[PDB]
Amino acid sequence: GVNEVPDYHEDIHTYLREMEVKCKPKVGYMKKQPDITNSMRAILVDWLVEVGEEYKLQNETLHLAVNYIDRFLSSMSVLRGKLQLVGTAAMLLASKFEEIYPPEVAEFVYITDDTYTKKQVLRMEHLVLKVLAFDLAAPTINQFLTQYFLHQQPANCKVESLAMFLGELSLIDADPYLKYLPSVIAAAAFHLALYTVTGQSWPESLVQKTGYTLETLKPCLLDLHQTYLRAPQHAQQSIREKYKNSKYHGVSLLNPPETLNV
Amino acid sequence: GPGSMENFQKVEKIGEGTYGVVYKARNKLTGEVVALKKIRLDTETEGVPSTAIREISLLKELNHPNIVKLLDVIHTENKLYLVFEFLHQDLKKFMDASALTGIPLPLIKSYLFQLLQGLAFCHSHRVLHRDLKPQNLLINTEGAIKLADFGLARAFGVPVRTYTHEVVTLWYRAPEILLGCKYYSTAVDIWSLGCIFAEMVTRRALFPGDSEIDQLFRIFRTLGTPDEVVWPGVTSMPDYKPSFPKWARQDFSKVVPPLDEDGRSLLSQMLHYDPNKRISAKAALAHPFFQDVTKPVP
Numbered sequence: 001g002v003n004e005v006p007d008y009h010e011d012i013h014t015y016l017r018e019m020e021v022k023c024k025p026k027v028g029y030m031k032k033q034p035d036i037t038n039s040m041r042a043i044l045v046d047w048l049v050e051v052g053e054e055y056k057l058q059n060e061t062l063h064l065a066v067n068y069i070d071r072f073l074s075s076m077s078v079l080r081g082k083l084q085l086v087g088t089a090a091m092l093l094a095s096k097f098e099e100i101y102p103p104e105v106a107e108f109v110y111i112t113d114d115t116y117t118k119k120q121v122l123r124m125e126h127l128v129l130k131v132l133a134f135d136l137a138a139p140t141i142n143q144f145l146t147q148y149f150l151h152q153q154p155a156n157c158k159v160e161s162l163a164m165f166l167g168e169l170s171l172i173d174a175d176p177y178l179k180y181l182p183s184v185i186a187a188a189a190f191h192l193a194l195y196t197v198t199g200q201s202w203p204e205s206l207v208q209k210t211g212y213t214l215e216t217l218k219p220c221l222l223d224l225h226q227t228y229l230r231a232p233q234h235a236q237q238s239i240r241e242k243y244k245n246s247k248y249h250g251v252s253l254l255n256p257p258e259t260l261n262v
Numbered sequence: 263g264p265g266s267m268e269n270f271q272k273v274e275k276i277g278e279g280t281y282g283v284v285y286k287a288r289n290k291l292t293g294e295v296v297a298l299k300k301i302r303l304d305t306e307t308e309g310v311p312s313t314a315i316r317e318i319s320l321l322k323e324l325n326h327p328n329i330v331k332l333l334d335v336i337h338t339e340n341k342l343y344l345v346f347e348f349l350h351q352d353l354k355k356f357m358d359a360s361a362l363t364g365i366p367l368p369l370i371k372s373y374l375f376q377l378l379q380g381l382a383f384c385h386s387h388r389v390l391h392r393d394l395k396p397q398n399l400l401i402n403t404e405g406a407i408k409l410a411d412f413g414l415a416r417a418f419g420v421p422v423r424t425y426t427h428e429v430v431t432l433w434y435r436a437p438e439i440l441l442g443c444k445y446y447s448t449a450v451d452i453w454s455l456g457c458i459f460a461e462m463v464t465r466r467a468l469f470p471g472d473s474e475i476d477q478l479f480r481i482f483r484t485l486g487t488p489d490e491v492v493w494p495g496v497t498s499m500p501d502y503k504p505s506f507p508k509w510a511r512q513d514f515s516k517v518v519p520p521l522d523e524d525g526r527s528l529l530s531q532m533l534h535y536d537p538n539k540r541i542s543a544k545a546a547l548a549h550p551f552f553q554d555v556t557k558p559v560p
């Protein structure tokens with residue numbers, strides 16, 4: 001019905017496809033950052049995952065924040081001591097954009113363990129807004145996922161949750177996910193989830209919608225499949241902890257497939 | 263961005279929201295008349311307001327002839343200036359001051375047709391307006407009308423999630439919001455436009471309630487109290503009560519007597535109880551009511 005916006009879903013998908021390209025971070029920016037590394041970024045994102053669950057924020061908010069951060073670090077060089085300040089302001093902006101009830105600024109100061117002042121958080125807020133030129137309505141993995149989900153016959157909540165989980169895992173690791181668009185990671189994540197839970201494969205209807213095939217998804221899929229296998233070993237564990245929860249059907253306890261068969 | 267306050271000459275104050283004041287101003291270099299919305303941050307303890315973050319980010323993306331244009335944003339440390347295209351009037355002032363003996367049917371038709379184009383463009387770009395009312399529709403001297411005030415607007419996902427409740431000025435608010443529904447969608451904007459359509463014909467609000475429950479009752483007394491047949495799920499809705507009086511649907515020619523058959527049809531499809539059956543902006547553009555549409559000036 002109207003909740004799935006029959007008359008606009010295609011227009012919207014097409015628009016999101018054009019926007020994800022505009023909102024894309026620079027693939028190679030971490031090499032151009034003198035003082036920070038993929039590893040430090042992973043620590044930040046893992047922390048923002050914990051912040052999101054402590055304040056019971058939407059997953060969309062988490063995804064937006066990571067988008068803001070990566071775009072910011074694409075043109076602005078940041079000392080390791082200030083990385084958290086960027087992340088905090090990102091999360092604040094994303095909260096004000098997507099949340100009904102965003103946490104107050106003071107709560108954002110609080111979670112930084114008084115590493116930063118409210119003035120520093122607010123001034124960084126302004127800086128991020130300047131650097132992004134207010135361009136905050138960014139397509140996320142989630143925005144594509146929810147559309148792809150409409151193609152399950154029938155809906156399977158384990159599939160949905162597992163896809164969300166895999167997509168979130170991809171936020172942690174700039175290498176190699178910075179090089180894939182949200183629409184493509186979402187596709188890879190949906191197929192892996194679907195295959196893992198039901199044995200089924202990326203449906204023809206989504207091939208029609210997206211123009212993507214298992215052929216075109218294969219690179220990303222291979223990376224996502226590795227990320228899923230080694231997730232119990234990753235240094236960052238907050239997403240796995242969150243997906244043990246019943247809200248998400250405890251999908252982090254599901255076992256990864258050992259092979260994909262193409 | 264590409265601009266500084268030095269180049270504007272303030273002319274008069276044209277408005278005032280809860281964010282601050284709007285002035286009509288003039289670009290001293292180009293000649294352009296603009297509206298400056300000032301948003302004060304220095305006074306702000308919570309940094310840049312979410313209302314402004316949404317308005318700017320969403321309006322940056324919406325270039326359409328029936329959506330007011332955000333021309334620029336001047337971003338000081340103490341103040342934020344939104345530069346907008348200037349339009350002389352809103353539809354509310356127009357209906358009150360010059361439409362004393364009515365808006366002619368050609369102009370009603372032109373206005374509704376433009377509003378649907380604007381709204382269709384919003385929905386196609388995953389934006390809900392959530393405050394369509396005559397005060398927020400701006401008219402120029404050329405006969406254009408444009409959706410304005412995107413401070414209550416929202417970027418949606420497909421399918422939609424639960425968003426803020428009690429959105430939309432009460433008289434323009436859809437039953438599905440009034441009944442506390444978990445989810446609402448593009449249909450809430452169509453309802454508002456339906457109310458506005460009627461309001462352009464009569465020059466008076468269609469459902470001027472003084473509380474949530476009075477709004478519902480005035481709607482029910484006009485369209486009939488909905489049941490499972492007209493609106494599957496209604497009786498399950500969180501703020502549906504079985505004790506609701508059961509009013510008969512009045513024939514639609516009595517709701518807006520001056521309206522013709524095509525008009526009545528279009529109106530009925532905008533005010534359908536069931537958000538799933540309610541007509542979309544995109545579909546409504548094809549309705550026979552518009553068969554002879556032109557763009558007359560006020």
Ligand SMILES: O=c1cc(Br)ccn1CCO
Nearest residue numbers: 040043044047080083084
């Ligand atoms: O100091 C911090 C804090 C967070 Br949270 C993330 C990254 N860094 C850089 C050094 O690890």
Ligand SMILES: O=c1cc(Br)ccn1CCO
Nearest residue numbers: 284297346348349410411
């Ligand atoms: O308040 C005004 C007035 C004019 Br005229 C144009 C834009 N705005 C801001 C809301 O759109």
